[PDB]
Every structure is written in structure tokens, then in C-alpha cells.
Design a protein around this ligand. Structure first.
Ligand SMILES: Nc1ncnc2c1ncn2[C@@H]1O[C@H](COP(=O)(O)OP(=O)(O)O)[C@@H](O)[C@H]1O
Ligand SMILES: Nc1ncnc2c1ncn2[C@@H]1O[C@H](COP(=O)(O)OP(=O)(O)O)[C@@H](O)[C@H]1O
Ligand SMILES: Nc1ncnc2c1ncn2[C@@H]1O[C@H](COP(=O)(O)OP(=O)(O)O)[C@@H](O)[C@H]1O
Ligand SMILES: Nc1ncnc2c1ncn2[C@@H]1O[C@H](COP(=O)(O)OP(=O)(O)O)[C@@H](O)[C@H]1O
Ligand SMILES: Nc1ncnc2c1ncn2[C@@H]1O[C@H](COP(=O)(O)OP(=O)(O)O)[C@@H](O)[C@H]1O
Ligand SMILES: [Mg+2]
Ligand SMILES: [Mg+2]
Ligand SMILES: [Mg+2]
Ligand SMILES: [Mg+2]
Ligand SMILES: [Mg+2]
Ligand SMILES: [Zn+2]
Ligand SMILES: [Zn+2]
Ligand SMILES: [Zn+2]
Ligand SMILES: [Zn+2]
Ligand SMILES: [Zn+2]
Lengths: 362, 363, 362, 362, 363
């Protein structure tokens, strides 16, 4: 007779949907018969086939409702409220553990019968990424600890090196593995605020491609990013809280999230250099390039820049004791799933091919 | 019974001082589920949750089906904001600070309780480190509090000065948490300062963080307008007459600027600005302080040395019960006794000794 | 079971509340039982104790309402509406008289059995202020008459003198005595017009610390204030209405308010100097300083900066016939209370201690 | 039982009230007993005493209404709608005739038993203004015709002369006699739009005190007004319609209203000079100044800058045949009222005193 | 019957093409009063009033007491705007122009009727003056209309060029009223042009008024970016591909830029811009035109020579009924007959003679 707003809210929650139009579009697909639904039989989208049958009755009524968007907004607000709560109550590690569980759910599907991803091509991604930097898995592990501990004046890493050396690649994968936002600090000192406002409630922040002015005789463009960065000392330090706002849509005082800054070997003042407790230098590697040429899927399926590849790397290299206790049982299941499909020699072989500059799957 | 009680939601909001509509909505929705089979209540994770779930369960169940959830929460939050407005205008500075203290104490009863996740020993170690940061640290804090409460004209600002990494921000941040207030950056262009100053509206105290100035910049010290800007805010700092504070294209309020702190490196302070401070505290780097921390990482990892709770523990351990407000003097006795049952003067003195040696407080 | 919106509006009008959140927070206090109300019995706030009993019934219901904020907004709108009508229909003298009755109501409490003010400390304030300038009570009275008559070209007084000579102290007291706003015109000629918008519907305005140029030699910061004032002739003179804009919207076309300009001794053009009907020179006095050092309470309690100190001075010095007929009986009452508290000799002694720089109450 | 929104609308209309808070404030004064209403007996405000009795019943109910502001907004919109209609349907002369009738209503009261204005002091204003410019009444008459005809490229007059020569005075009086808005064109080329938007629906526009840059060695300040004016050629010409908007609150395409530009003898390019079909040069006159010194009421009561003084001047000098036929009967009544109180010699005497530099009423 | 009919208000709005909510509200409120004792209806002042008062009286009386007046009018106006949107997308350019013409004709039936206040003789005098402004003026207008209607790529823009006061704006303004459209000023900074161009959205035609350019400025001709800006708008002027038009921080619509006119003084036109025009008409000052007007002030006072109605009268007097759209060819016959009954070829030729002599058209 009348639509259950609660049920729409429950769907948005289980789906973690915070987009009102997307929620509206998805729920409306449930108004059709679940009996011969091709979308459900073909198991195309989990966000659809796992919920159609259950929501069919409510959706049928929803389809006739005259307050559809209003119902969806309240659902989306409930999702936003839960993020609000988590942001204020969960420890930093729990936030991370939650993200890991969300990625593993995504992994269960892509590497499952729902069919889509070839777990072999992803481990090849792990091999390639493990040749981009020395002791790459330790680098990731240490980065995660630095992000969780969130120590004043010891929360930012600097990714520095020539173009095409892997800075954006690794930073993008870390951003997806942890959650967070990329920010452009090169903007003028009169809009750099609406930008910093995106950090609100964010676990981490990446200051992508910060352009300087020192040594611009090396084909290096001109930007204010560096100066506009050496003036955000209180933001980077994370000692005192800062006031952040994104338009009238949201405002909040808090310690600015920790993160990374990436730049193409410019000139870094000591006043800004002091803000970074670690600087990783990336270097172009002939073999990494040649490998990719013969391992096109890595780029075509955008595997090396994905957070799932980094999580897979942690599952393979890191001891179970290093993960949060609550998620350990699950990490064990994947370590076994990975050991079930890849012999050490088989994975080592992939690393070999990468170093040799040939196809990872050769 | 078939309709949500807005008044009950307002009561929860009021009890937890919730002035965030999204936070209220999310908190209340967690009460919709049975209280008998609640993981959150059995684990005693959040007081704001487990102390209220059972009582609000029936109402939350109804709230869960309501189609006006946001509107209900908005009125509840507006009530909390209205109360804050009344209190800011009618409570005495001393009462504001006292209520502030009762709240910190509640958080302490939990974090150091059976359901707590904090280790009282590591926090007392923070008090030890902090008591080595400055001479007679507990008097510095005590005197600062009286200064902020009395808010006497011309006697409202303290200058925190010294080299980088000497403790200026660590102490100011802990004081900001102990009394409440906002941190401001006045190292901006004159035609943008107005909005930063608006951040001080209704604040108990304000900290002008890392103010920089043109001069003596030979010490690798950057140039900044911070000093000049402050030197032009006499009426704000003195607090004799009210000033117009703006925020959101409108002077949201004309008031006595709050009292506070100014943290600053080793720049040259003009005479007309130096006159604005009733006290200047000098901070100095100390080998044992750095080395001690390296062996007591928990102090920084858990943000203990910059916590208002470390300072409150310090006052409870060092100051006479009589120096606290009458209303709370009882809780202070409660904490002084539990502090003595868990820490003999022997263990504390060694902690201070280890810090002085740069060993690692706890060992 | 129905809330009376009218009763909430009546409460707002009686306490002249035009702050929606304050009104809401105050009315909500009335929902609790009053018989044993300690706020009421210890008479802590007149805004509370004079109304709780009377509004308790309506408030109990109000507490059950789902439109609390909306009820309060209509109430606040009525208060704003009355001010609008009054600004357009009251005579300037009636406006001042209303202001005086409000200060007196506040004085009845302060110096009453439940007040927290010590009338002796406030009278000591009148003594200190009467030594700040020659014929002080005449200065204040002539100023009030100037502000009330609001005659074109004869509406602005210039307060000029060194730093710390009492310019702001007196300007602040007069602002409180008559009501109005202080304005900063040292801003760029750009964002200057939004500043003038602050003067909308104000009884008077004070251009605080107007800076110029050239005086930098005698150690005086530079600013545009002087220059800007020189270009605001039509605003200052008050012969023609001017267009004022506040909140990004032309709120009103009116005769700019009359007022004061305080300055730290810069050079003033003959054209600007012509905008002032009177100039008062403030001068530092060591005994005024020494007195304060031994009469701390005058600053700690902010007495010398208060509009109340000035009203008390007018009560003590001015003949009854100089006040508006309607408040005269109320003025006569305060004169009697003052004569009761202080003999001419007791007051003369205060003025003697000030002149001697020793402590007004010695 | 329930409030009549229609009746509130009728009041706002008869009162020409387009201010919601003012409307709210005024209507709420009608909720009180009309029997012993002091405001009505004292005949203080026409907007009140002429309507209290009639609205008493509706206002009493209004006082209890829960939608007060909403009711007032609809009333104000009705007033705005009527202006909208008139603006689009009335001829230019009818617009003027309507304004004249509104001023005469104002005059009937001020010069009537409601008591307030001394018609003798106002005619003295007519005398003074008639000595400010040669053939002043013809100047006004010709200006009105130019504003009504509104001929392309022949719609703007230039008021030019030294400071204190009468430019703002006459322009202010003409602005009130016709209706219209004063605009500041000195603003930067990035806000000069929100300003021009105030002209929408306006009968006339005055570009008050336009500052140039030519000859700034004569103590003449610096401004962009002149250039920002020589770029509004299409606005001044009024040949093609222009797009005007005042924030999101209103927008409209139309021919920019005709008007006046006033400036203190700067340098006027021929590219801008061509826009003015007439330029009136104002000159300081010793006797005008001395007269005012001995005729303080003229300035104190702001009579010489009022549109009512100019209307009185037209009633005295202009033949009835020159006014719109519909208003002629009324102009005759005032010509007789004026001839009833002032002999030609009596008025001539006033003009004499002005020329002699003595009190107009001597 | 006790409730307002929104549909009836929408119908009135639709009948009068009222897309202004305030204008609709005010117009409708005038119908609330009795139609039997209506001064406005008895004086036949406004067709939009007297043609509808009686019919809407009953509904307006109810509307007058409604508490949702603005909401009702808004839906009625939204309907008129929706119709305009449909027509802009589905009517042919020829139909748009025809509807435009029927509207001008209605205004003409009234202004020159018994209830009218206009004098047909003075307006015909305007046609006479205008026919002396340019050679074969009626063909210039006729050809321009076909060009605007066909809207053929590369053949959409006419250049109006000549000294100041030669008739460029007078003609363009009359053409703007005859076909509808907006006037634009492109003499702005490149970083502000985008918004001006947005004014052209949905317009039938556009006139780039008084475009100025750097060069030959010796002729006392100011410098301007108008020329350079146009020279950089090839794709807009050509009308082969759609362009993105922005208005209100969003490309409200991607469309073929409208065709139109460019008025311009005697500046130097680059080759790449000159190529953008299919026709250039030269305007020249004429003594008799100026002197004629001085003796026929009514032409300027009533704005007759710059009126679309003067041009419509010109087409009706000079062009063969066959050159008009079929749908209206009947009304054109209606006007050609009344024009011949009021004006013999003798009176008209003298008018043109007087203009040529600079006497004063009508005498
Ligand atoms: N270390 C490397 N050596 C050779 N090629 C690389 C290396 N890192 C990345 N690439 C290739 O070059 C591209 C550069 O990617 P990116 O990480 O965005 O570079 P940058 O360091 O400029 O951010 C990648 O998409 C990848 O295909
Ligand atoms: N007196 C000190 N001597 C040595 N190290 C210190 C001292 N005070 C603080 N530190 C360490 O250096 C960091 C500097 O902290 P902070 O108080 O913010 O410095 P600053 O004085 O520049 O504001 C702290 O996080 C702490 O780990
Ligand atoms: N004439 C004076 N002589 C000595 N001290 C004064 C005098 N006037 C005020 N003071 C003291 O100095 C402070 C200066 O106040 P203020 O009126 O703001 O000075 P300014 O003239 O700069 O506006 C006062 O609070 C008071 O303590
Ligand atoms: N022609 C004049 N001769 C002498 N004094 C005048 C004259 N015109 C105006 N005044 C006086 O000087 C003031 C100047 O007024 P105003 O019209 O604003 O001058 P401006 O020409 O600068 O706009 C008036 O208020 C009036 O008292
Ligand atoms: N060809 C002409 N010769 C003489 N005067 C003219 C001519 N055309 C128009 N005029 C007069 O000069 C004014 C100039 O009008 P307009 O068409 O806007 O000029 P422009 O060619 O500069 O755009 C007209 O209002 C009219 O009274
Ligand atoms: Mg990159
Ligand atoms: Mg610091
Ligand atoms: Mg001062
Ligand atoms: Mg002037
Ligand atoms: Mg032109
Ligand atoms: Zn399905
Ligand atoms: Zn629970
Ligand atoms: Zn009470
Ligand atoms: Zn009355
Ligand atoms: Zn009618």
C-alpha cells in the first residue's frame, strides 16, 4: 500500500550508496519482475542481483510513489551519518581494517564465479609493483603504520623523481588501498580553501603533482603548489586542528589528515622539507617499461595503479600477526587461496620476467 | 506510541552535547536494534551509545520508520545550540571552565576504567615529561587558567617564545583542549585577516599559532605579516572595549575578543606589541626530552603530551583541592585518591628521573 | 495542547530578543516547574525570573511542539518589524529616551538587592571620567543634543589626541549610551562600501582610529581612512539621503547617521576638517594613569568604558528639566538615590583622589 | 475566526508598502483597541490613523495567526505586481502624473491640520531654489519634458560645476519629484553591473558625482566613473534595450532609463560629451550662502533638496495647461491655495531677500 | 466554485503570452472587481485587460482571496515558458517569424483602431522617412528577412557600416523589433565575452551593436576589442556546427548560433572577418534626413523610425501579398486595403518628397 522508506535506507546502507540519483536509478530497477530478470540470472552487478528479490515488493510501490527523491535523500543522509559516526569513533586502525574488508568483498567477487578478473594477471601486477621500489612491501607496510599512528610533524611522505617513474602510480594505488582524496595545491591563494575542504572526514590526502619554481630550466613547468604548501605548515604538521569547509555543503574543524606529496624533482626548501619525515625517490627503469610492453593487460586493465594489487601484495608478503586481529581469519583464507594457485617459484618467475624486461606471464 | 517523540531525541542530543545533525542521526539509528543482543552495548565501546540504547530503543525503533528523520534531528541540534548560546551569555567564565572540566573527567572515568582502552600509567608518564618541559610547569598551567578565567583587560595574553621544536605548540594545543578555543593564523594579507579573526567568535580562548615577522630573518626565519598584524590589533588583545567579529558576510557578533596565547619562534617583538603581553614564557630544546621520547614513542603515538587530559591529571596531582571550583572539588578528591592508589611518589619521581636522563619515563 | 505563538512573541518583545537561538534557549527553560526553580528564587537573570511563572504553561506545551524554531522566528520577526517601524516613526529624542529607560532598567537591577554592581565603584568611574576632559558633563550633554537634532553639516565631532588619551574609552561609552556602531574606514576604497553598510538604521556611528599619511614621521602608521572620509562629504553632512548596502543587497536609502571620528594626530585636510562641527583634544594625564593603577576595579569591571557610567554622570550633574519629560520622574528618583549614597563631600573626595593620582576610593 | 489575507493586501496597496517587515510592524499596531488609541487621536501617522478602525478586527485575528510573514509577503508581491503593470502599460507622462498625485497627497497632510510643515518656509525654499539657476522653473519644466519624451541619444543632462554649487541639491530634488535611483558609476568594471541593475523599472537615473581623471591637479580626486560611463554608450543612448539584473532577486531587459550625470568640473571627452544634449553649469553664489546662514530652517528641515519644493515651484510658475489634463483640477486647487497665502509682492520679497543675502523671511 | 481554477489563470497567461510572474499577478488581480463598473474596460485602455475581464471576473474574485497567488501564477508562467521551449525546438523559422508578425498586427489593429491612441498618418510618415534612408529600402528589409529565416551557413550575417548617426542602429533596432532577438556588446575583455554570448541563447537573431576595433582610430574612432573578438568567432558566425552557449555558470544550451547583424562605424575590417558577411550595407548622413526630422519631431518622440511596426507597414505597402506566409496572406490583404483607403499614392509621394526636401514629411 505504501512505500517503506526504511527498506530503501537499508539498501543504500548495504550498498554504501551516497549518491541520490544513483540510488534512485538502482532502486527503480527492482520494480520489474524478479522471476525472469536477465540482470539477476546473468549475475552482472552485485548491487543489483543480491537485492532484487528482497526489494521487489517495496520497489513496485516505490515506482508509484510521489516522493521518490525525498526518500532517496534520507537514505543517503543515513549513509553519510554512519560515515560521520565512524570518523569520530573508530580508531585509525579500525578505519583501515574496515577499508580492507570492503576491498576483500570486492575481491571475492572479481576473483569469484561472478567472473571478471583473472587472479593470475593481478599477481603479475604484484610482481611488477614489487620491482618499482626496493623492499616495496615494507614500504607499503611502513606507510600504512605512518598513516595510522598519525604523529604530529611526522605524517607526510614525499614521492619525488623524474616523470614516468611511478609516483602517481603508487600514490593512486595507496589512495585506493586506504581511502582518501587527491588535492591540487597549485591553485591560487584565493581558492586553495574550497580544495582543502575535501579533506574533511578523509583518512588520507595526496597532494598530487605539486609544481614548484626552482630549476624550471629542466622543462619543469611553473606552479605555486610548493609555496602554497610551505604555508600550510599547520595543516601538514597536524598538531592543532584546522578549519575546513567545502562550500555551504559542509564545514568542520579537525586535524588535517596525513598523507603524501608527489613532485617531479624540483627544488625543495628546508622549511618545507622539514615537513616530510620520509622521502622516496622513484626512478625510471628500462625493464619495467619493456615488461609493460609485453604485458599490455597490466595497463589496459589498469592493474598496477589499483589498491587491490597492493592489498594482494600485503596478503602475500606480510605475516598474519601484522593485520588487525578481527581481520586475521580472513587474511589467512586469502593467503591459502594465493598459495593454492601460486607456487613460490611460479611467483618468483613473474618477478624474474619483470627484471628481465619480458612478459610477466612468459 | 505510534509516533516518534521529538522531545526524547532532543533529550539524547542534550545529554551528549550533540550539535552535529549527521552525528545525531547516526547515533540515534543505532538504537533501533534490540538492546538485548547489542554488540556495541556488550563491548561497552562508546558511552554515548551504551548508556542510552536501552532507554531510547523503543523510540529509535519508531524513529527508524519515520519519514522526517533529518527534521527531527535538526530541532534537537538547534536546542543544543540554543543552550550553548544561553550559557555563553549567562554563565561565568569560571563555570564555563568547570563544565569543561567535568566533561574531561567523564572521558577520564571511561578511558581509565574497566571498559577503557587507555593506560593510566602511560598518561602519568606524559605528566612527568611535561613537568620537565618548563620550570614549575604546574604553576604555569594553574596561573594561565586563572588568567583566562578572570579575563582582565590588558592581562589576557601570554607569549610562548623559543626555537622550533621547544614545546610551544605542544603546550598551547594541550591548553586549547583543556579550556577549549580555536587556533588562528594571522600570517595573512590584511585584506583577509577579518575572516580569520571571525573564527574567534564565542571562543573561550584563542591561540595565535606560529606568528611570523619581518626582521632577524637571518636565523633562517621566514618573513611574515603575523607580527605587524598583531601589532595592529591592540583593542582586540587588550579586551577593554568590544570589537566587531565577522563570519559569513556579516558581523555575526560584537564582543570582547577572547584572551589567549601567541606562539612564536625567535623573531624581534616591537615594543608596542610586547606591551600587549602580561607574561612571556621561553621554551628551550632539551636533549633528554628528545631522547626520552624516542624510547617512549607511545607519548607521541597516542598524543599524550599535547593532551588536555595530561594537563588535567597534572593539576589533580599537584594542586590543592581548594584551588578547584567548589562544585567539582569532590571529584578532584575522588581522582587524587585513585591517583595515589595507583602511583606512589616513588614511581613518579623515577619517571621524572628517567625523563631527565632521557631513558624512557616508564623505564 | 496548542502552543500560543503570540505568547512567545510577547516574551521576545518584552526582552527585546532578536536572536532566534537565544530566544529558543530562553523559552525552553520555562518548560520546567517554577515553584522550586532556583534560577527564579535566586533571581539570577531577569530575562528568566520575571517570566518563568507567566510562561510556564505555554512553555510546557511548546516543549512538545514540532515547530519550535519556526515559532521563534516569527517572534524574532515581530521584534525586527517593531524596530523598523520605530526607526521610521519615532523622533530621535524618543529613540534616545527609549534607550535611556532600557539602561535605567538595567541599572535598577545592577545596583539592586539582587544586583552584582557596587554603586560606589561606578560613581568612582564617573569621577575618573569627569577628570578625563574639561567640563565633561557638558561635553556629553552637548554631544547628545547634537546627535538628537541631527542638523546637516553639524553632525560630526572629531576626537583627536595621542595613543592612550581616552578617545576609544569615551567613544565606546557614548556608543553604549546612545546605541550605534563603530566603523573601520582604513579599508581599501573597494571593500569600503560594504563597511558603510554597517551604519544602516544606526542612531549614530563612530569611525574608530582613522589613519592618514604624513604623520609616519612622528611614528604613525599609514592608512586610507583620512582620505576616504574626505570623499564621504555627502554621508557626513547629512543633507541628502545616501544608498547603503549590507549583506550583498541595498538594504536602505537614508540620511547617513551622525557621529564621531577618533584619530591619533594625523594631518587633516581643510576640506575634511570642514566636515566637523567640533573638535575635542584628548591628552594623556599621568594622574589618570596612576589613579587607575590603584583603582584596578575600574578596568577589571570595565566601568570607565561604560554607557552606564555616563548616564550616572548625567544624573548627578544635569538638572531634571534637561531630560525628556517622560523620564524626568524616573531621573528625579535616581538623583535622590545618588544624593542618598553620596554627599557632595564624598564625591568631591573621589575627584580629589583622581587628580592626585592615588586611588579613587581612598 | 481566520485572517483575511486580502485585507492585509488592501492595506499594503493603499499604503504602497513594499517592505515586508514594515508591513508586518504596521499591521500589528492595529491589533489594539481602536477606542482609546493614542496614535489615532494624536493623528501622528496617516499610515496608521487612517486605517486602524477598519483593520482592527482583521488585525486582532492576524495577531494570533501562525503565518504572519507569509501573509505580508503576498501583500508586498501584490504591490510589486502593480508597479510591474504600471511600468509596462502607462505612458511616460502618466507615470509622472501619478508621482505628482502621490506628492500632493503628502503635501495635503504636511500643510494640513495634521500639522507638521510651515507652508511659508517651503515657499521660501522655492524662492531660494529659484535663484540657484537662471529661469529655474523653465529648467525644471524642460527637464521633465526631456525625461518623458525619452528620445534616443537625447536623454541625458549634465550637471557640472565646482563643489558646493548646487548639483547634488537640484539632482536630489529632481530625483524625488520624478522618482528614480542614484547610481555610482565609479565602481570597478567588475561590479558596475549589480549597480546598473537598480535602474530596472525606474523612471529616471542619476549618476551622482562621477569622478574622472582629467585635471586631477585641482584637488580633484581620482575615479573611473567617467571612463566606465563613456563605455555605457548603449545605456545612455537608450536606442536598443539592455540586459539589467540585481542579484538573483530580479532581472529584466529594457531600454535604460534617461537621467542626469553630475560632476565637479573635470575633463569631459567628446565621446562622452556627445551623450549629453544639455549641460547646466552651476556656480557658487555668495548671497545664496549668506541667505542660508540667516535661513537655517531651509537646511535643518532639508527643504531645498526636496522634490516637494520643486513641485510647489511648478504649481506657482507653470500654467495649468502644461500639466496632464487629469491632474489639472488639482493643480488649480493648489494655485489658489498658494495665491490665498502669498501675494506676488510677498513672494517677490522672499526672492529679494535671497538675492540680498539676508534671511528669506526678513 | 469555492476554489480558484489554476487552469483558467494558465489560459489567460497563455492567451496573452505572459511569461512574467509579477505582471501576471497584477493583471489577474484587476479582474477581481466588477466588470460592469470597470473604468479600464469602458475606456478600452489595454486589450490584455478588457478582452478578458468579464470572462475571468468570477475566477479572479476567488483568486483575490486565495492564499497561494504566487504559486498559481508561477505554474501559469511555467506553462508559457514550456510552450516557448517546445516551439523553439519544433516550429520552422518561417513559422516563428509569422507568429511574430501576427502579434505585431494585433498591436497594430488596436493602436490604429477606434480605441487606439496612435495616428496612422504619422506612422506612414515614418515609412516615408525610412524609405529615404537607403536605396531600395523595402528590398533591403525583405531580403534581410529571407536571409534570417533560411539561416543558411555562411550566409547569416549582414554588416551595417558608416559614420556616426547614419542610421545603422535605427535600422537594426527596428529589425530587432520586427523579428525579435537581443543586442550584444562584444567590446569586452576575452575573459568576459562568454557570458555576453550567452545572451544569444534561443534568440531568433542577434545584433552585435557598435563593434569597435584597433586601427584607423585617427578618425577620432576609439579603440576596441569588438573586431578582434568577432574575428575569433568564425564557427559562431558561420552557423555550420553548434557552439556551446553559457549563462548562469552552466552551458544552458549547445546550438547553432543565431544569424544577425553587426553595426559598425568606419573601422578597418580584416579579410578573415569581412569573409563572414554575405552583405554589407553602407549608411550615409543626409542633410534632408536631419532637417526633415527637426520639423517632424513626432518621428523621434514616438520612436517611429526605429519601430518594427514602421517596417511591417513598409512591407505591407511595398511587397506583393504573395511574398508573405500563406497563413497570414489574408491579413496582409486586409491591411493593404485599409492602407489604400487612408493613403492615396499622392499623399505618400509628397511625404517622400518633403523628406527629400527636408520639409517635414506630413507638411
Ligand atoms: N619506474 C618506471 N620505469 C619505467 N616505466 C615506468 C615506471 N613507472 C611507471 N612507468 C610507466 O610510465 C607511466 C608513468 O606513470 P606515473 O606513475 O604516473 O609517473 P610519474 O612518476 O610521472 O607520476 C606508467 O603508466 C607506466 O606504464
Ligand atoms: N623542549 C624540547 N626539547 C626537545 N624536543 C622537544 C621539546 N619540546 C618538544 N619537543 C619534540 O619536538 C616536537 C616539537 O613540538 P612543538 O611543541 O610543536 O614545537 P614548536 O616549539 O616549534 O611549536 C614535539 O612533537 C616533541 O616530540
Ligand atoms: N587621558 C589619559 N591619560 C592617561 N591614561 C589614560 C587616559 N585615557 C585613558 N587612559 C588609559 O589608557 C587606556 C587607553 O584607552 P583609550 O581610550 O582606548 O586610548 P586611545 O586614545 O588610544 O583611544 C585606558 O584604558 C586607560 O587605562
Ligand atoms: N550656488 C550655491 N552658492 C552658495 N552655496 C550653495 C550653492 N548651492 C548649494 N550651496 C550650499 O552648499 C551646499 C552644497 O550642496 P550641493 O548641492 O551638494 O553641492 P555640489 O555642487 O557639490 O553637489 C548646500 O547644502 C548649500 O547649503
Ligand atoms: N542618414 C542620416 N542622416 C542624418 N541623420 C540621421 C541619419 N540617420 C539617422 N539620423 C539621425 O541621427 C540619429 C542617429 O541614429 P543611429 O541610427 O542610432 O546612428 P548610428 O548610425 O551611429 O548607429 C537618429 O536618431 C536620427 O535622428
Ligand atoms: Mg604523475
Ligand atoms: Mg609551533
Ligand atoms: Mg583607541
Ligand atoms: Mg555633490
Ligand atoms: Mg550606432
Ligand atoms: Zn534482477
Ligand atoms: Zn547498544
Ligand atoms: Zn525559573
Ligand atoms: Zn490607532
Ligand atoms: Zn475591466
Amino acid at each position: 500500500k505504501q512505500v517503506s522508506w526504511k527498506l530503501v535506507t537499508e539498501y543504500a546502507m548495504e550498498t554504501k550508496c551516497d549518491d541520490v540519483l544513483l540510488l534512485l536509478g538502482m532502486y527503480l530497477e527492482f520494480q520489474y519482475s524478479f522471476e525472469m530478470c536477465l540482470k539477476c540470472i546473468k549475475k552482472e552487478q552485485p548491487s543489483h542481483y543480491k537485492y532484487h528479490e528482497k526489494h521487489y515488493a517495496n520497489a513496485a510501490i516505490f515506482a508509484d510513489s510521489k516522493n521518490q527523491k525525498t526518500i532517496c535523500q534520507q537514505a543517503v543522509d543515513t549513509v553519510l551519518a554512519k560515515k560521520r559516526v565512524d570518523s569520530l569513533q573508530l580508531t585509525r586502525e579500525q578505519m583501515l581494517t574496515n577499508r580492507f574488508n570492503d576491498l576483500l568483498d570486492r575481491m571475492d567477487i572479481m576473483f569469484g564465479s561472478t567472473g571478471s578478473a583473472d587472479i593470475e594477471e593481478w599477481m603479475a601486477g604484484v610482481a611488477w609493483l614489487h620491482c618499482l621500489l626496493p623492499k616495496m612491501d615494507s614500504v607499503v607496510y611502513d606507510f600504512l603504520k605512518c598513516m595510522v599512528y598519525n604523529i604530529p610533524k611526522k605524517r607526510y611522505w614525499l614521492f619525488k623523481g623524474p616523470i614516468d617513474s611511478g609516483k602517481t602510480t603508487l600514490a593512486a594505488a595507496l589512495l585506493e588501498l586506504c581511502g582518501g582524496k587527491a588535492l591540487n595545491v597549485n591553485l591560487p591563494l584565493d581558492r586553495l580553501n574550497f580544495e582543502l575542504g575535501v579533506a574533511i572526514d578523509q583518512f588520507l590526502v595526496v597532494f598530487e603533482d605539486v609544481k614548484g619554481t626552482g630549476g624550471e630550466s629542466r622543462d619543469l613547468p611553473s606552479g605555486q603548489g610548493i609555496n602554497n604548501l610551505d604555508n600550510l605548515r599547520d595543516y601538514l604538521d597536524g598538531s592543532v586542528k584546522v578549519n575546513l569547509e567545502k562550500k555551504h555543503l559542509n564545514k568542520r574543524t579537525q586535524i588535517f589528515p596525513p598523507g603524501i606529496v608527489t613532485m617531479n624533482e624540483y627544488s625543495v626548501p628546508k622549511t618545507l622539507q622539514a615537513r616530510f619525515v620520509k622521502q622516496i625517490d622513484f626512478r625510471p627503469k628500462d625493464y619495467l617499461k619493456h615488461c609493460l610492453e609485453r604485458s599490455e593487460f597490466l595497463l589496459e586493465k589498469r592493474i598496477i595503479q589499483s589498491g587491490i594489487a597492493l592489498l594482494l601484495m600485503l596478503i602475500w608478503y606480510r605475516p598474519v600477526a601484522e593485520f588487525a586481529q578481527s581481520i586475521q581469519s580472513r587474511i589467512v583464507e586469502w593467503k591459502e587461496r594465493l598459495d593454492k594457485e601460486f607456487s613460490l617459484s611460479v611467483y618468483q618467475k613473474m618477478k624474474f620476467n619483470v627484471a628481465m624486461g619480458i612478459g610477466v606471464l612468459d
